[PDB]
Design a binder for these strands. Structure first.
Ligand SMILES: [Mg+2]
Length: 706
RNA sequence: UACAAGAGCCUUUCUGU
RNA sequence: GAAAGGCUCUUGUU
């Protein structure tokens, strides 16, 4: 076991304006009776699940008198069976025989019943309301099996989801593909009661025309995914109506396999009271030092200059696109437009580029870049025109970031031939950040009280190669804020063993980031806020145990008797929690989604632990997915309001756009550093790969990854 | 490879068949 | 269930 438990909730959030919401969680009436856990062993071990459930029903209907009495038990399909009342077998094991036909053959099955444990729903009710510190996971799987018994028979199971055939609304897609509609069904705990999380979904099947229920797994063209996008395009009201109609049609409250366990489910979505946090003010620079107010999570840079602008004296253009497509007229027009746009933004580009020549292939990247470095003293930036996807991008990134230490920016050919003010403005944001300047900062007086002391913000993420591997290693990236502003971040990366979830060398990189912070700000951080991405809920305990100890070890290696407060937050942006507006007057945009800054820490979240949802971004397509934040550790004793406000404001510090993003800036930066390090390994034994992801000394202290 | 966000194919594969 | 990765597509935007 581990000795680090996640902290409980300090309080509930109060700040922000109240918004009425409806989450796709359905209240569950769980009785206090004890249900009984069994296990079924069937030989051989390669039985189909369909005939497994069929022979389970055959035993129930056949051996009714001997064992099963008058009960209807539930089965997950593979191993374990549950019954609401105890079968008269005690600890005994009974071997029975099942006769079945086959595809021209005959099958004889042997089946055994074994008692396992007595799981209690009273203990679950105690754990759901501040009595037991841990929700009993065995009870959760038992309840999930109970509620997914009949969907596994009426519909066709697909993973954890059930898909039914489309009636009337069938999309032919292409060939024999269809648009079979279904839903993900899961059982989640909450402080108030048990919740049935249900989200609507669709996938291709093979009912076709001259056996139905065959899911598509083969390969086809790109037209099918576009047609399925057009068929399944659902805004927030569309998903809300689909899930509500699905729950009204399914009717769990009339299922006999649910009634024997004495369970009621609510047919309506749970009403949850959210709060829309106000956005921070964005302080720009230049002459006016204009202040931008994010309206619906989006602001602009019109009549605004960078907080610190980098004047570009000498720059180069390396066009790897063909001359006949990307001409000199296009390059000159792009240069003039970029110079005027950057002059508007407080980033003056003085004069024409020193170098502007064409090149071909990734083999020419290193000699051309070496010539650029050795010929033009004081060179600040090389613009790389690329003809779409190419290995030239990976070679350029490897040469500029790890080999030569040259700041480079890649632009597609299509964005040079046809320029837009927004593309050039976003480019200028990238250039200003890549050249050492800061675009904007949070308003220092509009920031939470955490910023009144030296505080570093860390973001971590691990990218793993797909399984069936082991020559390809995993990459762990950690970034750290470098001022009280925080908008500039230093990046540290490591290569580690394949498919490893914890960060093995976290202490070394956190030590490097702390050293860089102490160099840049001349102060050690009194508070370390650690945003960790890509950690599953099962891995929470081992990830916390390894990584909190690694952070403490790094702080000790920095200086004796140096133990700053650490907050460990795990970001999960992939889940099935969907939030909708109860009233139409609070829907935002054509997608009708919740406004940016909507935070939920009630009634759908964890019973006894510091966790919350925050939709910091403004959804413009589909239904917004609010990022989930779980506080695995908190030495600083953050209030809920302060932590949520800080998270939202950190989501407002992303430098690549004038937008509020779904996750805070350090987590996004760690993700980008992991992707960049993956690009650095394209040319590729651990020491050869540890040296490959190591960026140049002139590249280490800048935001190459932006 | 201007950027954000949301979905689908598709890929290993734990499998479930 | 998940690594998120590709492949796109959509909304687009100063
Ligand atoms: Mg990642």
């Amino acid at each position: 076991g581990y000795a680090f438990k996640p902290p409980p909730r300090p309080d509930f959030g109060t700040s922000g304006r109240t918004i009425k919401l409806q989450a796709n969680f359905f209240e569950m009436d769980i009785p206090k009776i004890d249900i009984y856990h069994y296990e079924l062993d069937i030989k051989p071990e390669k039985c189909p699940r369909r005939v497994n459930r069929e022979i389970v029903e055959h035993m129930v209907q056949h051996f009714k008198t001997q064992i099963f009495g008058d009960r209807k038990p539930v089965f997950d399909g593979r191993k374990n069976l549950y019954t609401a009342m105890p079968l008269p077998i005690g600890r005994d094991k009974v071997e029975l025989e099942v006769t079945l036909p086959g595809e021209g053959k005959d099958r004889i099955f042997k089946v055994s019943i074994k008692w396992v444990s007595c799981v209690s729903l009273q203990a679950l009710h105690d754990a759901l309301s501040g009595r037991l510190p841990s929700v009993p996971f065995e009870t959760i799987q038992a309840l999930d099996v109970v509620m997914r018994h009949l969907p596994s028979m009426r519909y066709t199971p697909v993973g954890r989801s059930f898909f039914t055939a489309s009636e009337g609304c069938s999309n032919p897609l292409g060939g024999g593909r269809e648009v079979w509609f279904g839903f993900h069904q899961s059982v989640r705990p909450s402080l108030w009661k048990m919740m049935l999380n249900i989200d609507v979904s669709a996938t291709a099947f093979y009912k076709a025309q001259p056996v139905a229920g065959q899911r598509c797994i083969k390969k086809l063209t790109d037209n099918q995914t576009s047609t399925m996008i057009r068929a399944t395009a659902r805004s927030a009201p569309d998903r809300q109506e689909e899930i509500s109609k699905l729950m009204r049609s399914a009717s769990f409250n009339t299922d006999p396999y649910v009634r024997e366990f004495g369970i009621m489910v609510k047919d309506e979505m749970t009403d949850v009271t959210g709060r829309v946090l106000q956005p921070p003010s964005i302080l720009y620079g230049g002459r006016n030092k204009a202040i931008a107010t994010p309206v619906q999570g989006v602001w602009d840079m019109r009549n605004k200059q960078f907080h610190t602008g980098i004047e570009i004296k000498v720059w180069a253009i390396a066009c790897f696109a063909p001359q006949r497509q990307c001409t000199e007229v296009h390059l000159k027009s792009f240069t003039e437009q970029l110079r005027k746009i950057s002059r508007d933004a407080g980033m003056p580009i003085q004069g024409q580029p020193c170098f502007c020549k064409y090149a071909q292939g990734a083999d020419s990247v290193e000699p051309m870049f070496r010539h650029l470095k050795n010929t033009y003293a004081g060179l600040q930036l090389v613009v790389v025109i690329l003809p779409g996807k190419t290995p030239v991008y990976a070679e350029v990134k490897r040469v500029g970031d790890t080999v030569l230490g040259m700041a480079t920016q890649c632009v597609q050919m299509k964005n040079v031939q046809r320029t837009t003010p927004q593309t050039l403005s976003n480019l200028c944001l990238k250039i200003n950040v890549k050249l050492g300047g800061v675009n904007n900062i949070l308003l220092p007086q509009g920031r939470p009280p955490v910023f009144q002391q030296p505080v570093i913000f860390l973001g971590a993420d691990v990218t793993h190669p797909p399984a069936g591997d082991g020559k390809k290693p995993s990459i762990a990236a950690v970034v750290g804020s470098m001022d009280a502003h925080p908008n500039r971040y230093c990046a540290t990366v490591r290569v580690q063993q394949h498919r490893q979830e914890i960060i093995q060398d976290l202490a070394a990189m956190v030590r490097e980031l702390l050293i860089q912070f102490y160099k840049s700000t001349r102060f050690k951080p009194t508070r370390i806020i650690f945003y960790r991405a890509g950690v599953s809920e099962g891995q929470f305990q081992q990830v916390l145990h390894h990584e909190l100890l690694a952070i403490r070890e790094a702080c000790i290696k920095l200086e004796k008797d140096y133990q700053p407060g650490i907050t460990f937050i795990v970001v999960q942006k992939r889940h099935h929690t969907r939030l909708f507006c109860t009233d139409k007057n609070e829907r935002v945009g054509k997608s009708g989604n919740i406004p940016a800054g909507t935070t939920v820490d009630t009634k759908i979240t964890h019973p006894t632990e510091f966790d919350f949802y925050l939709c910091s971004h403004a959804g413009i397509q589909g239904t917004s997915r609010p990022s989930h934040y779980h506080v695995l550790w908190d030495d600083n004793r953050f209030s809920s309001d302060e932590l949520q406000i800080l998270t939202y404001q950190l989501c407002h510090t992303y430098v690549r756009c004038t937008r509020s993003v779904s996750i805070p800036a350090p987590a996004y930066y760690a993700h980008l550093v992991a992707f960049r390090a993956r690009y650095h390994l394209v040319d590729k034994d651990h020491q050869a790969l540890a040296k490959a992801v190591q960026v140049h000394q002139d590249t280490l202290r800048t935001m190459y990854f932006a």
